[PDB]
Amino acid sequence: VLSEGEWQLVLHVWAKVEADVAGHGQDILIRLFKSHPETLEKFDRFKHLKTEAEMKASEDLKKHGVTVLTALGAILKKKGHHEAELKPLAQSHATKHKIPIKYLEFISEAIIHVLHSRHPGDFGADAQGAMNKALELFRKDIAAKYKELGYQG
Numbered sequence: 791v792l793s794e795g796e797w798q799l800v801l802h803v804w805a806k807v808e809a810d811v812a813g814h815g816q817d818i819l820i821r822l823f824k825s826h827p828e829t830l831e832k833f834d835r836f837k838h839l840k841t842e843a844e845m846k847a848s849e850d851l852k853k854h855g856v857t858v859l860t861a862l863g864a865i866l867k868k869k870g871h872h873e874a875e876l877k878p879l880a881q882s883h884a885t886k887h888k889i890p891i892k893y894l895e896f897i898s899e900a901i902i903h904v905l906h907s908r909h910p911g912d913f914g915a916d917a918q919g920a921m922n923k924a925l926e927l928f929r930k931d932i933a934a935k936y937k938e939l940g941y942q943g
């Protein structure tokens with residue numbers, strides 16, 4: 791479990807994202823899709839996008855980035871007490887969207903990478919450490935529900 795000091799770090803950083811949630815979401819999704827193209831294929835909604843310019847121009851992609859980071863923000867603000875928030879996400883990602891846990895690792899690395907872009911004067915080492923712990927806890931708990939459902943090794 792994260793310490794309170796580590797949660798403080800997580801949420802300080804998170805408040806940063808909230809200054810421009812759509813901008814952060816955009817950059818995170820694009821970094822995910824470009825770094826790991828197998829992920830884009832999982833989105834019927836986005837798979838027509840063939841270049842980073844097209845991705846940056848997509849208003850719908852930006853709208854979806856806000857849905858994603860709104861859900862993740864809410865989970866982080868529960869400081870590990872996120873059973874009710876995670877249940878429907880693990881269910882739809884395992885059984886409907888068919889997203890492997892590996893891809894949740896990729897989007898976690900994209901989140902970290904986009905922070906090294908947007909908060910390069912904060913996002914200190916301590917904060918990077920805590921954010922990776924928070925995202926690992928998120929993946930651990932989703933993986934446990936994947937396994938229950940026959941989707942996690």
Ligand code: HEM
Pocket residue numbers: 829830832833834835857858859861862878879882883887889893894897
């Ligand atoms: C930080 C991790 C993530 C969070 C918080 C998140 C959150 C969400 C939410 C809130 C929705 C809409 C509700 C739902 O369908 O349950 C959704 C939809 C979706 N997610 Fe995620 N997601 C994450 C990671 C991923 C990843 C890594 C992928 C694929 C590589 C993915 C694929 C999808 C797809 C395909 C949809 C349906 C989009 C549509 O067609 O409208 N998700 N996600």
Ligand SMILES: [C-]#N
Pocket residue numbers: 858
């Ligand atoms: C989900 N994006």
Ligand SMILES: [Zn+2]
Pocket residue numbers: 825826827828
């Ligand atoms: Zn990849």
Ligand SMILES: [Zn+2]
Pocket residue numbers: 825826896899900
């Ligand atoms: Zn990556």
